[PDB]
Design a protein around this ligand. Sequence first.
Ligand SMILES: *[C@@H]1O[C@H](CO)[C@@H](O[C@@H]2O[C@H](CO)[C@@H](O)[C@H](O)[C@H]2NC(C)=O)[C@H](O)[C@H]1NC(C)=O
Ligand SMILES: *[C@@H]1O[C@H](CO)[C@@H](O[C@@H]2O[C@H](CO)[C@@H](O)[C@H](O)[C@H]2NC(C)=O)[C@H](O)[C@H]1NC(C)=O
Ligand SMILES: *[C@@H]1O[C@H](CO)[C@@H](O[C@@H]2O[C@H](CO)[C@@H](O)[C@H](O)[C@H]2NC(C)=O)[C@H](O)[C@H]1NC(C)=O
Ligand SMILES: *[C@@H]1O[C@H](CO)[C@@H](O[C@@H]2O[C@H](CO)[C@@H](O)[C@H](O)[C@H]2NC(C)=O)[C@H](O)[C@H]1NC(C)=O
Ligand code: NA
Lengths: 454, 454, 454, 454
Amino acid sequence: EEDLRRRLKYFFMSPCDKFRAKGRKPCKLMLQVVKILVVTVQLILFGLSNQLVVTFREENTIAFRHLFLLGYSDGSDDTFAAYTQEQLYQAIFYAVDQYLILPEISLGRYAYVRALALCQRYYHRGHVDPANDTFDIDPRVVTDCIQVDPPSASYKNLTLKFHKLINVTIHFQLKTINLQSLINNEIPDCYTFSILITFDNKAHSGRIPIRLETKTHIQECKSFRLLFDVVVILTCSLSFLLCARSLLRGFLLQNEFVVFMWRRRGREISLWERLEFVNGWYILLVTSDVLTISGTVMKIGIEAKNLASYDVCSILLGTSTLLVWVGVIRYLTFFHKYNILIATLRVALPSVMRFCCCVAVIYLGYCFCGWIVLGPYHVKFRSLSMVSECLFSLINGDDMFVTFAAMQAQQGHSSLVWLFSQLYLYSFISLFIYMVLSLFIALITGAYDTIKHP
Amino acid sequence: EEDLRRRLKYFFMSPCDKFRAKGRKPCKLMLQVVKILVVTVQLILFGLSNQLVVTFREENTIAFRHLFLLGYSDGSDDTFAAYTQEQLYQAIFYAVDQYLILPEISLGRYAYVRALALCQRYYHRGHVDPANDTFDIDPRVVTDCIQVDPPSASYKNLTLKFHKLINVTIHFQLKTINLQSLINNEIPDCYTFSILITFDNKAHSGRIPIRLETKTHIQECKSFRLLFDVVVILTCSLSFLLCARSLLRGFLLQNEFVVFMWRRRGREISLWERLEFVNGWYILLVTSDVLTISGTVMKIGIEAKNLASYDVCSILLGTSTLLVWVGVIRYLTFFHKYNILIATLRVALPSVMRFCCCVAVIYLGYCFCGWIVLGPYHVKFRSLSMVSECLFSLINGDDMFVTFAAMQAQQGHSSLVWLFSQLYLYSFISLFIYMVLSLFIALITGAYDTIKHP
Amino acid sequence: EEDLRRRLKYFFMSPCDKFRAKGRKPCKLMLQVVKILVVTVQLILFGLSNQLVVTFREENTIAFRHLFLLGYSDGSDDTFAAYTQEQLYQAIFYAVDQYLILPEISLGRYAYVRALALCQRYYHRGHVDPANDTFDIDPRVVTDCIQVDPPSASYKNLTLKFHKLINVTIHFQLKTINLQSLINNEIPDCYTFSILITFDNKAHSGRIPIRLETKTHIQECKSFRLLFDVVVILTCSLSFLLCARSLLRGFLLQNEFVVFMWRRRGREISLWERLEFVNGWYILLVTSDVLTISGTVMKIGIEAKNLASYDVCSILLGTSTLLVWVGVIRYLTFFHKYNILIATLRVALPSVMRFCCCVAVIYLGYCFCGWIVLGPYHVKFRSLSMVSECLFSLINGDDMFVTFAAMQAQQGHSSLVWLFSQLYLYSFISLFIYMVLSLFIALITGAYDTIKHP
Amino acid sequence: EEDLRRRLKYFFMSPCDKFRAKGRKPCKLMLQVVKILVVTVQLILFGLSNQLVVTFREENTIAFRHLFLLGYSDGSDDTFAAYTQEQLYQAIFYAVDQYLILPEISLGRYAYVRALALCQRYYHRGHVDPANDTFDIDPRVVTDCIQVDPPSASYKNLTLKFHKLINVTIHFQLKTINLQSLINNEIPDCYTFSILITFDNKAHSGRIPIRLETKTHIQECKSFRLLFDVVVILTCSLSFLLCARSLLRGFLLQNEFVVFMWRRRGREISLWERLEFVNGWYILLVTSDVLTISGTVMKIGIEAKNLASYDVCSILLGTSTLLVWVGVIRYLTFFHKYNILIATLRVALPSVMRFCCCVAVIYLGYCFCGWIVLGPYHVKFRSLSMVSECLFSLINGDDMFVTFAAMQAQQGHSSLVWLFSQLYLYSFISLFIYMVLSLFIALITGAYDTIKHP
Ligand SMILES: *[C@@H]1O[C@H](CO)[C@@H](O[C@@H]2O[C@H](CO)[C@@H](O)[C@H](O)[C@H]2NC(C)=O)[C@H](O)[C@H]1NC(C)=O
Ligand SMILES: *[C@@H]1O[C@H](CO)[C@@H](O[C@@H]2O[C@H](CO)[C@@H](O)[C@H](O)[C@H]2NC(C)=O)[C@H](O)[C@H]1NC(C)=O
Ligand SMILES: *[C@@H]1O[C@H](CO)[C@@H](O[C@@H]2O[C@H](CO)[C@@H](O)[C@H](O)[C@H]2NC(C)=O)[C@H](O)[C@H]1NC(C)=O
Ligand SMILES: *[C@@H]1O[C@H](CO)[C@@H](O[C@@H]2O[C@H](CO)[C@@H](O)[C@H](O)[C@H]2NC(C)=O)[C@H](O)[C@H]1NC(C)=O
Ligand code: NA
């Protein structure tokens, strides 16, 4: 009788009450504090390594734009184009000539890689004739390359085909050595820059945009942190073991209560009792455990095998650290102790969540109105997604006088879309500022009263 | 006695309670779910058709600006003008010369349409003489055209009349073929671009702005969705039939109660009883029915007859989809069941709506103060409507440091409008942020308490 | 006994109750409705007259900038300067040469006014010698003019004195005729443009800014609204008579109650009874009366005598219309009737107003901290007033990422102002968003509960 | 018995009640009012002295940029660079040639200081060879100067070493005389401008940025306020004496109560009684005392010894004035009198402060997610601090449509970071606008109810 009662009472005993009664079982909570310190120190010490890499890439791409592009100002990337015929010839010829004299010009020690390959791509047999609308078009793509070697009569006399042109692309490589890595007490890693100038002509609209994308391949030239990540996986795995034993002990006393409620037979106490046995935090911490050790094993594999995709490793570690810090709030809820602190998902959280569904639908309806009506006349409403970004910017207010001014400029001079757009925007702003934010305050205040005073 | 009572009770029976008692009358609610899916799939599949058209127009207008306008940078449309005399001559002569050599320049396959017509418009007899203020002006407009044919001594030697000039306009057509429509598994539609360069001289202020408007006419050259819109009109019309029978059955039991309250004679129960009989949602859904089928019949007529005005069809379909999604909230109010959920328009909604009138008037008064006082000194307050956009931007905060800086620049150096403008703007911001948003929260919270706890 | 009681009861009788009992005393309330219509129609019909004038001025100033200034792009007014020596000579010589050939260049019919007067202003005897710090300076200003007549050897060979130069100013006039005023069914008013180019050298810092201010003088060349303003002053004056009789009748029954409370002798009922006798709205309406008729008499005097100062007339009419529209709320408070609706200034309004004093002081303290500390390092914090505009923009959020970026750029590289500026800005934003807006909601909600439920 | 009781009652007696009973003890409160006036008049009269200095510096730096830098537009400081080889030579040679003819060019009376010293800094023995990855690098820095004297064959023929270059710096001085200080009734202070042009090549990335920093040294050439600061330190020190006696008298009656509660022996009344004896404001005012007199003694020392570091003096005075104005609120709490008005730090302030900890952690977790994941692809997320500025700007809404557009531009075209970034940003905006601001309102309203109605 007595032993079965106190095991439940020891189970829901707060650890601050449990230290002042039992005395010194420290090894559980200490490694949670160690986990927060060790994971964030790994994340910061990795993040500075990326920033030292990335800005060395970002300055080199800009220095390639001022060298290989013709007439490139700064901050005008997307509206950079070649409209006439001679501008396309001049933008090709200037890009090659700046390659063949590159050691006599640039300032970083750029070396060649043994070369440059110009290549255009036109249709197999295209005949566009707008006087008779005759087309006889195989959409088969025939790529016609041309080679240029650096230390010409072969390079010039080039004939583009402006009536079936798809792409004019230039591809080459460059190798450079980081010299910042002298003082940083490391072996300077040699980089390989792979450049692909693109003269895109997909839309065939008499406007060819131009862009220049780079790509790196970091390789060591002609042991601290390697120990540190082993520290992280051992620390985090011991938490994965120990918390799993805590939850299955929670299942042990989950079933131990119910069997005792058959000899008593208290009407087979429902699902809202067995759910009151487990926890509200250890599932969050153990989900952080699996995410952390998965990202770190991927991080160990990268820096020996290949260093290209710092992408899935980044999206896993950045979520693991988020779950750790949000997992610290438990320490600030030992002071609270309302006796389950999980019935909020029965009581208060449903009445805010179906309101969140009601807000989500009305917001979706104004998306589907704005994208079709104010699509062809306005510049910021092309895709459905950019409509979603523009209306969600209008809620808090970021982009709001620019859209009324752009609406005021012409808007067709139809004076029906404009009378629609005033009635559209004023209603949508005045709805989600006043009659939605205020309902949301009334719901959360009703929740907080319902949790506290009962 | 019993049959008349239960017909009322079956009427207000919720459908989730009605399935668990009666059993399987599914055909009503199912087509509402089908309606939401079918209307939104029509709207999305139409909207992508517009975006593939519109961006092909928008790139071609920009490529016409870089070809036919002199000295056109990008993003400087409105402050593009010709101030001297030679700039107006050079902007005309350059626009014609780029037309007569257009196949040797541009990149899209632009073909002529058999031509270019330059034409100026000056007054019949105007004599402006500022030394004696003598005017003898017939405002009769005499248009003097001139023809130019492309494959000149006729084109040059042109004499403008800068003392009675109204407009110098150039009009011509261009025909091109979309070549993007090869891979999209369709017949490539040939377009016809109609260009109208405008040298406007309306205000006679020594500043002539320049702009270039295009206009398209899409025509097929030398059956999926056509079935799909027939699916929409049949689906939506069956809802228009079936919901109308539901509401007139609502009128049937509207009158059936009142006649039974004459044999009882319960003091001839008032308008707030017969209004409690109908609904709060089927009028919204049937208004979506009429709007949907009207827009679709207009959409069928467009793609065979003429394709110019995608304007009223767009403004009807974009409203119909809005009413559908806002009409989904009924499914989230079966869980609620407060026994009419329409008396809010008697109880709670009036006490927010007359407050909304009180906010609307004060906002209108600050419009009429700002437009006359801060009109002549500030750039953003010309019309009354742009004042309305500027103050409504200042409420949420979008344009707020720019207007104080523009106020700080000169503001006449009268130092009376500036002392007014500080007292104007600070009071208007501090009113509608604090003492209006907070009253609105107190009203909605009082509404939600009044609906719930009584 | 009975007659003295009902005169009080008729006094506080609402007019909607007073029509349904007494019957048809309409002439009081009708002219209030007439007042709202007539004043706003005057204000709108005057405001369109200003906008037709002002944009004709604003385009002519821009067309003067492109003609008389050297190398003027658009939207770069304040950072337009002449730094070297030859740039100051070239900006003078170009401005005069464009004046002497002005009818052969510009497009509006600009005529001369019989002329141009160049004039510089230098000190009487200034000797600046930085090798010995010797100054012997009379600050007496000696103006040296030079005349130029238009249809030169006299104009050139000009010698500026760059070691004691204060101002180089050019002044002349231009006359033009509005030709837009043909179709507008009026007599076209001839304008006189007075231009003053300024080469300011006040700060002696090796940077001379340049600006060009115009000034107009509208005069008729070689009766609807005149009646309409007489309609306004007669309408508004009859309200000034009739409401004054209403308030002095309010003083009549103010004293009639108190004398009857000496025969009763109800302990000499206090100031919060005699204040409950008058009103809360007629003082607002009669203040709108005096402001309206004052501005209109000034408006009559302007359009015959001189048309320069549309400034005090504008600041009076724009306030009168504001008081009228805010004065409409009384019609929406007949429905309310809480029996004085002025004791809010005893009950609820003091407890928000001393909180408004407490917010006003803390805001003032952060002004005096920011202007001295973040003054010399940051560009937006020069005056105290521009600090007030910048912090008040940071409250609602308009200018907030720009100031952190400007703080991040250098900020001295002292790393003490930066550590101060992070702690400054984060505390000031987080205070007035959370812990002030929320107290203000709690005060207004406490006010609304106190007014309603007691 | 009686004397011990009334000393406590006189202690908590409000001064407005204390004047109407005792009568005229004015000297305490009067100097607090004098303190507010005297400190703010010192602060304003000092702040205008800084602004007259700083704008004379800020215009001279800009006028040095247009003279000594090649091809400098305005507002383009950070993206000003030299990418090729000839641009670095031309930017050096142009900067020196504009120095050797400086009195024949500039407008302010700039004089030389007897000179210019060009000097480059390259590595001791560097060999970068990307064909074999051979490096043999001493990172020892060998500075190679070159002298130029102004009134050349020595200046030209300069050989940079582009393969081991670190810095190319030019240093010289200029002396000028303020001439604005004639009319300001003072002795004109001669300034010394020290200029350091920097051609930084730290990252070795083929992109050399260019910047020009100045530095002043104000010295008088060949008594009002000096008295005024002595007034401030004497005023503020008398407050430091008098308030200290008030607090130690507070300790005197702190111990006088407790000894009387041993003869009574009221169970040794706890820490929440002895804390109710002192104050809540005099510690704030005396902290303002020490800060004020410290900053002023530093201010006296500056204007005789050296005038460089107006930095710690500014950061102390700007905090002292803040504490004074926030210290005025006590006058508005004599009207209040809730009988301690400090138990809020026991009652209400803890339940908002641990919520402020819970908000602070979640905000920190989204920092550590955003900086690693959205680091390499986005321009505004480089450091951790600029992530903190960007997310805190997104809360109130300042930078919100720019970040979605920059996310929409490429974002790698990996379509996994983009699907992450939508889910990242939408959750973070919707959390701290709705479900945090509303909890904060519910906490402050619960605080205000708890303070008032109990
Ligand atoms: C230039 O256009 C060609 C098509 O003419 C592109 O080649 C295709 O690219 C897509 C995506 O990489 C592939 O799915 C196709 O298989 C490619 N087809 C052929 C025949 O190569 C080419 O990628 C374009 N250039 C760039 C830089 O995008
Ligand atoms: C150029 O000015 C002429 C007037 O001189 C405009 O012609 C008028 O245009 C309006 C609107 O289209 C019509 O209501 C009038 O009937 C037209 N009058 C004549 C005589 O044609 C012309 O439209 C202007 N050009 C442009 C491009 O707007
Ligand atoms: C150019 O500088 C002169 C001073 O050298 C200015 O003349 C003074 O202007 C102020 C304000 O108008 C008057 O209070 C003084 O009496 C004027 N003094 C003299 C001697 O004229 C002149 O105004 C400046 N030019 C401009 C356009 O502001
Ligand atoms: C140019 O580069 C040199 C290094 O080659 C810089 O000199 C160092 O500057 C730092 C910071 O001032 C000192 O800690 C080092 O002791 C300096 N080393 C030497 C050898 O001087 C120099 O400061 C750079 N120029 C500028 C303007 O920053
Ligand atoms: Na902005």
